[PDB]
Ligand binder design. Structure first.
Ligand SMILES: c1ccc(CN2CCC(n3cnc4cnc5[nH]ccc5c43)CC2)cc1
Length: 298
């Protein structure tokens, strides 16, 4: 006999690998087919797992599963459950599968069909998704277009939370000392220099996402491609970070993309203020971006 009081627990035997969606360092995301009937009646899902797990990495993963479970918003990827695989001696995270993939590969593939008002719609939704996290005191710490997913032409969702921190009620930022390479060209200056993270540091990285949208993910226009151009293309290793910090702290910034409206470029530069306290909130950005759209609606 069988009684199911928990549909969030996926059975590993009925869960079948199809192709890799994303592969990192200590993690990986797969497209899977789940068939509790095995005649193929079950959902296509997305499954995250650990690779080169530490005991420390598993404790983080359990925390990231908690985070994602705590979130219900039209612009946050849907949690579906967990699978305790390897006969209950392993943990994996099960999520909805969004057919269009990450915003990055979508905008690179369909960059002709996607006009400015459209880029503005996805920008607004990323903002709302982030204002929702801030209501929870969550710090994302990794906004870039590869971590944003496209459910269809008119909706995107924030779709990874592997670095997400939860601020205590007492504090306004999270200092996190961590080993290994960081996405330095998306990082706020205080994040580069003091490992400090906050809603304001996510605001910074948001400005870079907006830049990425307005360059239509063109490789020669990308943040590292344009920063390396300013730092010097020949720089290697620690030297780059030294120069990137010095360039940022003296107000050097990414250029306005070809064809990007000044008012949209201006939003990027407000996001990139060295003064954490002069960065707009995500509520301010969603409101500005929606009024811009509405003034381009009629
Ligand atoms: C290791 C961990 C995370 C990452 C980020 N990386 C994971 C895969 C993710 N992704 C790409 N296409 C997707 C379609 N449906 C999905 N449902 C949930 C995620 C997802 C999709 C994009 C972000 C890369 C490497």
């Amino acid at each position: 006999a069988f009684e199911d009081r928990d549909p969030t627990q996926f059975e590993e035997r009925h869960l079948k690998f199809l192709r890799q969606l994303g592969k990192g360092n200590f993690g990986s995301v797969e497209m899977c087919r789940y068939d509790p009937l095995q005649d193929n009646t079950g959902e296509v899902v997305a499954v995250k797992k650990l690779q080169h797990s530490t005991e420390e990495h598993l404790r983080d993963f359990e925390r990231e599963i908690e985070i994602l479970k705590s979130l219900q918003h039209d612009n946050i990827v849907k949690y579906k459950g967990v699978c305790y695989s390897a006969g209950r001696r392993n943990l994996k995270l099960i999520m909805e599968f969004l057919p269009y993939g990450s915003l990055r590969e979508y905008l690179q593939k369909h960059k002709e069909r996607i006009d400015h008002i459209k880029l503005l719609q996805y920008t607004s939704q990323i903002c709302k998704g982030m204002e929702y996290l801030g209501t929870k005191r969550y710090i994302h710490r990794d906004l870039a277009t590869r971590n944003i997913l496209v459910e269809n032409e008119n909706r995107v969702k924030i779709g990874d939370f592997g670095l997400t921190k939860v601020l205590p009620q007492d504090k306004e930022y999270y200092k996190v000392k961590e080993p290994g390479e960081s996405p330095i060209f998306w990082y706020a200056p205080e994040s580069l220099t003091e490992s400090k993270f906050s809603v304001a540091s996510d605001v910074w990285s948001f400005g870079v996402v907006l830049y990425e949208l307005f360059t239509y993910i063109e490789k020669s226009k990308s943040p590292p491609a344009e920063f390396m151009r300013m730092i010097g293309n020949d720089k290697q290793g620690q030297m780059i970070v030294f120069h990137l910090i010095e360039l940022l702290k003296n107000n050097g910034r990414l250029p306005r993309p070809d064809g990007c409206p000044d008012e949209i470029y201006m939003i990027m530069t407000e996001c990139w203020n060295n003064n954490v306290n002069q960065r707009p909130s995500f509520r301010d950005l969603a409101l500005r971006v929606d009024q811009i759209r509405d003034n381009m609606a009629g």
